[PDB]
Motif scaffolding. Structure first.
Motif, PDB file in Angstrom:
ATOM      1  N   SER A   1       0.866  -1.179   0.000  1.00 41.78           N
ATOM      2  CA  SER A   1       0.000   0.000   0.000  1.00 41.78           C
ATOM      3  C   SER A   1       0.910   1.239   0.000  1.00 41.78           C
ATOM      4  O   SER A   1       2.005   1.181   0.562  1.00 41.78           O
ATOM      5  CB  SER A   1      -0.873   0.016   1.260  1.00 41.78           C
ATOM      6  N   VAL A   2       0.506   2.355  -0.605  1.00 39.93           N
ATOM      7  CA  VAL A   2       1.365   3.537  -0.504  1.00 39.93           C
ATOM      8  C   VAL A   2       0.727   4.741   0.154  1.00 39.93           C
ATOM      9  O   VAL A   2      -0.482   4.780   0.387  1.00 39.93           O
ATOM     10  CB  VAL A   2       1.966   3.981  -1.844  1.00 39.93           C
ATOM     11  N   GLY A   3       1.573   5.713   0.467  1.00 35.85           N
ATOM     12  CA  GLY A   3       1.137   6.984   1.010  1.00 35.85           C
ATOM     13  C   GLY A   3       1.669   8.128   0.162  1.00 35.85           C
ATOM     14  O   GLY A   3       2.820   8.123  -0.266  1.00 35.85           O
ATOM     15  N   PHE A   4       0.835   9.125  -0.076  1.00 33.91           N
ATOM     16  CA  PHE A   4       1.194  10.158  -1.011  1.00 33.91           C
ATOM     17  C   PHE A   4       0.642  11.498  -0.573  1.00 33.91           C
ATOM     18  O   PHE A   4      -0.292  11.565   0.234  1.00 33.91           O
ATOM     19  CB  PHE A   4       0.576   9.825  -2.343  1.00 33.91           C
ATOM     20  N   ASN A   5       1.221  12.560  -1.128  1.00 31.33           N
ATOM     21  CA  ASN A   5       0.702  13.908  -0.980  1.00 31.33           C
ATOM     22  C   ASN A   5       0.574  14.568  -2.338  1.00 31.33           C
ATOM     23  O   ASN A   5       1.391  14.330  -3.223  1.00 31.33           O
ATOM     24  CB  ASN A   5       1.641  14.724  -0.112  1.00 31.33           C
ATOM     25  N   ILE A   6      -0.447  15.392  -2.523  1.00 32.72           N
ATOM     26  CA  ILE A   6      -0.577  16.107  -3.786  1.00 32.72           C
ATOM     27  C   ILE A   6      -0.049  17.521  -3.617  1.00 32.72           C
ATOM     28  O   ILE A   6      -0.300  18.186  -2.613  1.00 32.72           O
ATOM     29  CB  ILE A   6      -2.007  16.076  -4.326  1.00 32.72           C
ATOM     30  N   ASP A   7       0.703  17.964  -4.609  1.00 30.70           N
ATOM     31  CA  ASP A   7       1.632  19.068  -4.453  1.00 30.70           C
ATOM     32  C   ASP A   7       1.517  19.876  -5.716  1.00 30.70           C
ATOM     33  O   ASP A   7       2.350  19.770  -6.623  1.00 30.70           O
ATOM     34  CB  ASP A   7       3.039  18.486  -4.336  1.00 30.70           C
ATOM     35  N   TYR A   8       0.466  20.680  -5.785  1.00 27.76           N
ATOM     36  CA  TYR A   8       0.072  21.258  -7.056  1.00 27.76           C
ATOM     37  C   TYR A   8      -0.099  20.085  -8.021  1.00 27.76           C
ATOM     38  O   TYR A   8      -0.455  18.994  -7.584  1.00 27.76           O
ATOM     39  CB  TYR A   8       1.055  22.358  -7.510  1.00 27.76           C
ATOM     40  N   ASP A   9       0.133  20.270  -9.312  1.00 28.97           N
ATOM     41  CA  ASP A   9      -0.266  19.223 -10.259  1.00 28.97           C
ATOM     42  C   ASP A   9       0.409  17.854 -10.042  1.00 28.97           C
ATOM     43  O   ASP A   9       0.019  16.855 -10.663  1.00 28.97           O
ATOM     44  CB  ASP A   9      -0.126  19.697 -11.718  1.00 28.97           C
ATOM     45  N   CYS A  10       1.389  17.800  -9.142  1.00 23.97           N
ATOM     46  CA  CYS A  10       2.232  16.612  -9.011  1.00 23.97           C
ATOM     47  C   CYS A  10       1.977  15.723  -7.774  1.00 23.97           C
ATOM     48  O   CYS A  10       1.891  16.206  -6.653  1.00 23.97           O
ATOM     49  CB  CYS A  10       3.698  17.032  -9.072  1.00 23.97           C
ATOM     50  N   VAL A  11       1.865  14.417  -7.997  1.00 23.47           N
ATOM     51  CA  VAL A  11       1.683  13.448  -6.919  1.00 23.47           C
ATOM     52  C   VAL A  11       3.029  13.097  -6.296  1.00 23.47           C
ATOM     53  O   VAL A  11       3.897  12.548  -6.961  1.00 23.47           O
ATOM     54  CB  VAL A  11       1.011  12.150  -7.447  1.00 23.47           C
ATOM     55  N   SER A  12       3.216  13.405  -5.021  1.00 29.79           N
ATOM     56  CA  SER A  12       4.497  13.109  -4.381  1.00 29.79           C
ATOM     57  C   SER A  12       4.413  11.934  -3.400  1.00 29.79           C
ATOM     58  O   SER A  12       4.010  12.094  -2.239  1.00 29.79           O
ATOM     59  CB  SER A  12       5.133  14.375  -3.746  1.00 29.79           C
ATOM     60  N   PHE A  13       4.793  10.751  -3.888  1.00 29.37           N
ATOM     61  CA  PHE A  13       4.792   9.523  -3.095  1.00 29.37           C
ATOM     62  C   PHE A  13       5.879   9.582  -2.041  1.00 29.37           C
ATOM     63  O   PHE A  13       7.024   9.893  -2.349  1.00 29.37           O
ATOM     64  CB  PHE A  13       5.017   8.302  -3.994  1.00 29.37           C
TER      65      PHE A  13
END
Lengths: 300, 5, 301, 300, 301, 301, 300, 5, 5, 5, 5
Positions: free
Chosen positions: C147-159
């Motif tokens: 399973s992963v964890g991520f943050n959205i950072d303007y247009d970019c998905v930062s895993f």
């Protein structure tokens, strides 16, 4: 508006102050009706005052030793008689200016005006508080030793102090008009020294209220804190140490809500401290911490 | 120590 | 108006979830362009569990001991390599729904969103902070590793996180997306345990503001105090034990200013603790006890 | 010993205090001889508001619209002139207790007992300074107008202050008895400034001298010492007497600093006697001595 | 700027430092031209320390019961001779690094540096003052003796201390470089305790100047103003300028208290631009100014 | 026995000190093998001081605007380049006394030794710690810039600091030996100022041990307490104000145990503050107030 | 060795305990000479006890209502007479076992033995302390209401408690043998409730000394501290926060000197705190910090 | 409990 | 509240 | 005072 | 606040 330390109009009391000379020694005297009161020790000279033997000094004297003077008029001294540390001098004239008056014994924390006078004439007047250590701090030069302290209400002058000495710490002691010293002092020049005095709470709160009626008001508000005076109460309830880039970081929400970080800290700090007393913050109790500064700015 | 005063 | 724990919209990241199989054992993995990252323990059987030799077990695995698959649309595993704690596995095609993406390495205190997946298929999204101790308090049941964890950072998905194990405590460990564990831990069922915690302050202040914004500000208007509490400070600072009677005497003022004694008390309660700070009450820089309460009722109606 | 803001006794002045009344407004009047003065707005009734027109306010209230009461009998008001910002009110019967008096215009930097009265009745007295900004910081609530600031100075009561109004920031300002307001204000109701004010440098030296006469005497050059005076104060603390050639060798250092060595001595001699009150000399609290003047020179 | 306690570059002295052992007992040696000096008692054992007859206790000994080691280099001792509390060992080699040197006898109160050596090698350099009682307050350890004390004038190292023993009080004592003890002491594990130690007046003054030169002026009891100089710091902080009349008005008080006006100006001036630092004038933290010169004479007749 | 501030023996590092000259201006530099590092401001005149352009001033300097020299034995400057805040300057020969050496980058709290030099010549060695705020409190007068700081680390000299400027405060800034400033500061006479300090604890504990070792241990045998101090805690913990009289009553015991009241008091003084910690007094895990003092004299002679 | 809570040998007191039946109601009684004392309220039944009217209940009775029994022997009740909250019953026999005795009123903090007995016979005995809130905590079943508390010395029994009731908090009150309640309690079953009780200092110190004579001794020593209970008093005096690798780092000098870091911390912690009281550490005052853990190991 | 999921 | 006892 | 030595 | 009085 305004708030100043304010003595009672000295008038009513001014006219009961007499001179009391007895040798080369002159004190003041509080002359009411047909009696003049004044410290004993007026029956002393420099060379006495040691551990003097009063009454062994009094009535070595008699009525002719006492020079009582209401300014102009010499008053005549029928009968003299000691009274604790006072002297009740009896005189051939009821004082026409005598006021509705009463003798009281003030309690520590209470205040009076002092009508400080030399050679039986009013020099000045100022308010004064009875410390809880029984001394009181006024301006008393040598030769002031009769001058009195009083309060007024309507018309009844209330005498509660007559001034005898100055403890070596620079404070002053004295006696009610029964001649009994306020505190544990003997009227006699010895190695005695004032108690260990403590601040008068109810008078400081009293004063604060007064700061508020002239809308000085600031302190009333939540106080603020400093940084490392906060970390000091972090480690307590087990919180990460807060830091300078931790603060400019909260900038955004400071500005947005208009509340400095350090003033928020202040309240975080009490929330730890005194608890939270059955109040809910965002329907919560336990202080949430899985929300970052941004997770907040996003949601809002 | 103290003065009368 | 409203404040709830919010997870970033999982849409973009679902696109990337696939399952990885090493004959029997099934993790889920991250399909990005043509690489599929997934925990390196997939190359195990619950026999090597105890304390495996990975470099050995991996070096005995063919290139197609790996059955990667997405929906079905099966992907053949052209290449493979162990990179820290992940396997790379290059695949025969590229996720046409790879989003703009990044492999940040979050820092303790930073929340991110987690996409609990089971055999390559979504299921749950919830919100997590990487505790200062290096665990995170997630919800992970079996066959979720990967399973992963991520943050959205303007247009970019930062895993920032992928899921490996769970400490006996009940918390969870894991790695960044370059195979490095968040913390001291290692991927072996040998009982490690987590440092001691401590709360993250920054986020409690951030949270506190949130409450202000949402119209909860009592905690700003600060304190009132209990009498026995005060007399503690009173005694500390050589003040006179404040008593029941005193509190009455004050009444009249505590009334017409609006500020009842014990509150005014909290105000003196450290006006001494920490100063007047350059400032002045009634033109004074000290506190003034030479005024009775009558003295003050007297000097103003 | 002691030192407090204490005002002149108020006896002489309380007896000249009456309550001027002009219909809807009662205020305070200073009653001397047949002339009973008081503020020139006793006349008004609110709609003189922010813009008062004075001069013409009477054929309107030509006499008899003035109560003016003392004790509790009365004064028939047999005249009335508009003295600048107040009104002289010539009255049938003269005042039995009118104390010998000047009338002065005091000037910034100076003090004067104020006797705040409410309804021709005094209630307290206290000191006040004419700030170089031409305000005074007092305690007047409404009813106070007309209360008077006075000095004494030899049996003869001076007068200098009839109280008029309170600017925005707490302070007040008022007139002399000759009528001209103190400072650039006007008995209007319009918002007005209040200079900048500076610190009364003559007073602050006076006060310092006050503190010196009390023994509170810790400031400055009261110091310089001679050799012997040090050499002996020396071995009182085990500091190895210092000879002439010692002084000679400190010289080069004496010169860079422009501190005669004997002034250093003096400076040290003090630290030997009153310690340090814990302050850092280069970060120690114990005077160092494992440095020679040589190595000090070497390092600078 | 700054002021630390510094020492002369041990370099020149570092290369004269050799190890002198005779059976288990190892200590240090100063190696100039073709001699090494070092305490006697290198010829001792810890069983004869208290009552050791040195003359004769050397012999029994000879030129080959001393191995002197300078690095890993030996040098034959080719002659032993006691020299008061030293030993003059004559080596077969002159020290290629022997510097412009010279023996001296420090007077109490003059700092010198010390190079602490153990087993023939420098450990650290730090500097001592020679207290008037004749002890120094160093940091010497068992096996350190023969550590030297030098000073440096341009080109020429000037030795004044070899290090022998350590009084009970916690201080130290040694000899000059021809073995004449400093003070009333002898190398004789016994009754020796330190004569009472007075402070070095000079060096405290020097130190105070060091202080001034560096910013620390507070302890300085002086100066003076003129109504002119003063008037210019008075304006700085919105005060009235002291007009020449004020100086006259003051007169009376200035006569009562024997303190000429200016000195009070000088005194205020000073205290204006520095503060009080937690002290109270007439029990007040702030400078008062609502008492005219009269109200002062009025109250303090 | 003894504890003084000790600097590493400067011998090895002196070997490396030379002066560098850019026509008039003279720093000192570090000669190691065939490179000579020195502050990059040497390429200045007290005109560019204010806020110089280094990359510009350097790019206008020839290869022999540089007169490096050691003793005399002059060295010609074959190459040159600005590396962060130093210049490299490669020279025509190699210091035959380059020692084993390293360019560590010390960490706040770590002491090192400093070799104050003036025009390439020794002078002073003293001991310094890199404050937590990133300054160090040295002794540096003009034309010392380029002085270095070093630590000895078994056979190897580890250079950690070279000297550039001095803040108005009175402290000193500088760079590691690879041209990077220790801190926020920059080499321009534009008034920067230093963060706020705070003491280094580790080193205060280290120092505290040193005192133990040297036979100063009173501070271990901890406290005794003042009566009014106690009654503060007494009141906090709902104990009964301990009074003069009580202290006597106790006498008899405070005697024959040897432990006078106020000390025993410091012992109760937080037996409540912080627990009994798992342990037990007289088989009890609470404190026992149900025994008068006579009760205890009674139950044992 | 040993330390146990220890009651006085009940013997001397055992033999003065009588039964006192009066209806279906039976208490105990302390019988001395020709008088038996015991709570009033024995002249009550369940259905009374409300807010009962004693004396309005007493002498509705008379001598025949009281069944006094010294085990075997019935004692005869000549005269009855109320006394505060007791009953002085007069009887036809001086009690042969009466002891040298005295009635005292114990002070809060003091201790006695309670001889708790039912139906006038000794059930058990145990020591008991008089709280400063005037209640005292023993074991009292219903029907124990006469039993007494005493101290002994030589031979003189000293009665200081006789037991009446059990406040709803589970504690017990009672009276001296003059019948006056200890504290503010009335003997009557109402909404009353014990004060807000506080711990008895001098008895805890007392006890500690006792812990020391049986060499329990541990606490006596310096206490230790924990890590983040230290940083908590770091930020105070402004010190870097101490950490876990900061500790194993001091390992070496811990081991060498044999002193845990955390026990050194403890003392660093007080050094901040209570100062240093004119003691020198390595000839210093201000706590040195430019010495690293190693700079120390090298020098030593 | 260390437990690789 | 309380019991006699 | 910033002062490049 | 600019008023009398």
């Amino acid at each position: 508006s305004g708030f100043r330390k304010m003595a009672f109009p000295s008038g009513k009391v001014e006219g009961c102050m007499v001179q009391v000379t007895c040798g080369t020694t002159t004190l003041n005297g509080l002359w009411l009706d047909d009696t003049v009161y004044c410290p004993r020790h007026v029956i002393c000279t420099a060379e006495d005052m040691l551990n003097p033997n009063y009454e062994d000094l009094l009535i070595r004297k008699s009525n002719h030793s006492f020079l009582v003077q209401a300014g102009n008029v010499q008053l005549r001294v029928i009968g003299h008689s000691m009274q604790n540390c006072l002297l009740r001098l009896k005189v051939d004239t009821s004082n026409p200016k005598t006021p509705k008056y009463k003798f009281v014994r003030i309690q520590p924390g209470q205040t009076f005006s002092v009508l400080a006078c030399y050679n039986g004439s009013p020099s000045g007047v100022y308010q004064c508080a009875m410390r809880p250590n029984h001394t009181i701090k006024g301006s008393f030069l040598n030769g002031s030793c009769g001058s009195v302290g009083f309060n007024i209400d309507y018309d009844c002058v209330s005498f509660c102090y007559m001034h005898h000495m100055e403890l070596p710490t620079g404070v002053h002691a004295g006696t009610d008009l029964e001649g009994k010293f306020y505190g544990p002092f003997v009227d006699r020049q010895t190695a005695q020294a004032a108690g260990t005095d403590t601040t008068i709470t109810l008078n400081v709160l009293a004063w604060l209220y007064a700061a508020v009626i002239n809308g000085d008001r600031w302190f009333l508000n939540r106080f603020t804190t400093t940084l490392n005076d906060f970390n000091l109460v972090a480690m307590k309830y087990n919180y990460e140490p807060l830091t300078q880039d931790h603060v400019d970081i909260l900038g955004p929400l400071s500005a947005q809500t208009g509340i400095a970080v350090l003033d928020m800290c202040a309240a975080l700090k009490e929330l730890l401290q005194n608890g939270m007393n059955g109040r809910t913050i965002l329907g919560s109790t336990i202080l949430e911490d899985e929300f970052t500064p941004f997770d907040v700015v996003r949601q809002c | 120590x103290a003065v009368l005063x």
